[PDB]
Design a protein around this ligand. Structure first.
Ligand SMILES: OC[C@H]1O[C@@H](O)[C@H](O)[C@@H](O)[C@H]1O
Length: 461
């Protein structure tokens, strides 16, 4: 049972809450290593924990790979967003992170560490602002500011370190030394003035992808991404990813999951407790599948429960009840279907003669209360009210599962096998436009009028 309950604090095999906040993950050999950090009683760095697992569900605690006692400089400081990377040349692992003095956020510098073994305790080197000796000054201190950070290993074996500089206004991609333990130079300045934070750098099909959040502290915001053929130039504009709050989380890292059937990408996010005035140690996690519709189109869906298989390399929503259904309209006699049976996102929903097609079959996922999600079978997209409309004539379409109320539906029995499927957003129910009795009849949203065109039959397949 490789199921994951989003919006909660995962537990280790010991039954204790996992504390690897704002962390990344590394795949070395036959093991996945999850690294992260957690505060003490004074909201300061006390230790970086390490968990390993082969199924990505059952994590084994391996103690602190880094601690406040690991170095006299770490006794009292703020460390966040620790990422690790492996080096084929050296044969050792190098850890990077964001370092602060612990009394304010003026230092804005990066830190380095390394170890012979992943689960082994790293040895702290030094904290510094990227390229201090270049005689460059960034807001009074020497060297570029380094806040939110993340690591990336290219195909050619080159190491890279990206962080937020110029008061979090710009992004800096630094080319690392062959040993990954130092910064050789900077590759390019990305998205200046955009003020993008919590950067995540990944690569697929010769394309470079950069997932970033917004700069609004604990407040969950809109996550975005961009692609490019090279790192120096050719970067596309920022495109939205997920909803307006990234499903109440902030992107921390993205990792390719190798399997037998193929490869899928795991999005890791942090649900910072600071959103509700909670301690950093209370923060939760949000893992989601990053789908690549195309080379220039990504989708980050939200599933309250996500099933994953490492050996298979598959990441998708977990549906406890896979019973397929067909919604038949009382009036028209037609069944709920997707226009042209398209699997494309934002596809129009129309009625059609029962032809036993996949596009006419639907799943039913309970989402708490008397409400459920109506997910199409052919395309994993769910029934959705376009632009979260609250008015009559609101066109219905199939959209990426975003946990929005415009995607939750309540079934109400009115006798026989017919129901009145109302929306959780405004209460208005599913309605065939103009009582249409022909094929291609636009399925919409409308007030309860007691008309047969608003009555649907639930049929098994
Ligand atoms: O395509 C427009 C989008 O508007 C969003 O506000 C809504 O949550 C999505 O379901 C989709 O309708």
């Amino acid at each position: 049972e490789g199921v994951i309950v989003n919006g909660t604090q995962f537990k280790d095999t010991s039954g204790n809450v996992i504390h690897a906040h704002g962390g990344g993950m590394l795949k070395h050999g036959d093991y996945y290593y999850w690294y992260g950090e957690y505060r003490d009683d004074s909201n300061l760095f006390l230790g970086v924990s390490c968990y390993r697992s082969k199924d990505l569900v059952n994590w084994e605690y391996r103690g602190e790979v880094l601690s406040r006692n690991s170095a006299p400089e770490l006794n009292h400081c703020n460390i966040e967003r620790p990422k690790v990377m492996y080096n084929a040349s050296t044969g050792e692992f190098v850890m990077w992170m964001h370092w602060e003095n612990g009394i304010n956020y003026g230092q804005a510098r990066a830190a380095v560490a390394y170890s012979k073994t992943p689960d082994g305790k790293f040895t702290y080197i030094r904290s510094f602002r990227p390229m201090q000796d270049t005689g460059v000054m960034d807001h009074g201190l020497p060297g570029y500011m380094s806040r939110d950070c993340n690591v990336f290993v290219d195909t050619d074996g080159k190491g890279y370190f990206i962080s937020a500089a110029n008061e979090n206004m710009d992004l800096h991609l630094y080319e690392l030394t062959p040993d990954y333990k130092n910064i050789a130079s900077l590759k390019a300045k990305l998205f200046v003035g955009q003020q993008r934070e919590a950067p995540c750098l990944i690569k697929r099909n010769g394309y470079y992808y950069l997932i970033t959040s917004g700069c609004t502290g604990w407040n969950p915001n809109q996550a975005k991404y961009a692609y490019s053929k090279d790192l120096a130039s050719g970067w596309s504009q920022l495109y939205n990813l997920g909803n307006s709050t990234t499903y109440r989380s902030q992107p921390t890292f993205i990792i390719p999951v190798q399997g037998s059937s193929g490869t899928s990408y795991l999005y890791m996010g942090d649900r910072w407790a600071g959103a509700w005035g909670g301690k950093v140690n209370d923060s939760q996690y949000v893992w989601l599948p990053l789908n690549f519709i195309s080379d220039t189109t990504l989708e980050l869906p939200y599933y309250d429960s996500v099933k994953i298989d490492a050996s298979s390399g598959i990441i998708s929503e977990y549906i406890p009840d896979t019973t397929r259904y067909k919604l038949v309209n009382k009036n028209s006699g037609k069944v709920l279907d997707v226009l042209d049976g398209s699997v494309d996102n934002a596809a129009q929903i129309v009625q059609w003669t029962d032809n036993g097609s996949l596009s006419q079959q639907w799943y039913l996922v309970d989402v708490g209360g008397g409400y459920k999600k109506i997910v199409n079978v052919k395309s994993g997209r769910a029934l959705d009210v376009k632009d979260e409309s609250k008015e009559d004539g609101g066109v219905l379409i199939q959209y990426t599962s975003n946990g929005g109320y415009n995607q939750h539906w309540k079934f109400t029995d009115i006798g026989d096998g017919y129901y009145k499927i109302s929306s959780r957003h405004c209460g208005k129910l599913i309605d065939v436009r103009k009582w249409s009795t022909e094929d291609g009849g636009i399925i919409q949203q409308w007030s309860d009028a007691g008309g047969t065109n608003q009555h649907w039959k639930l049929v098994l397949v």
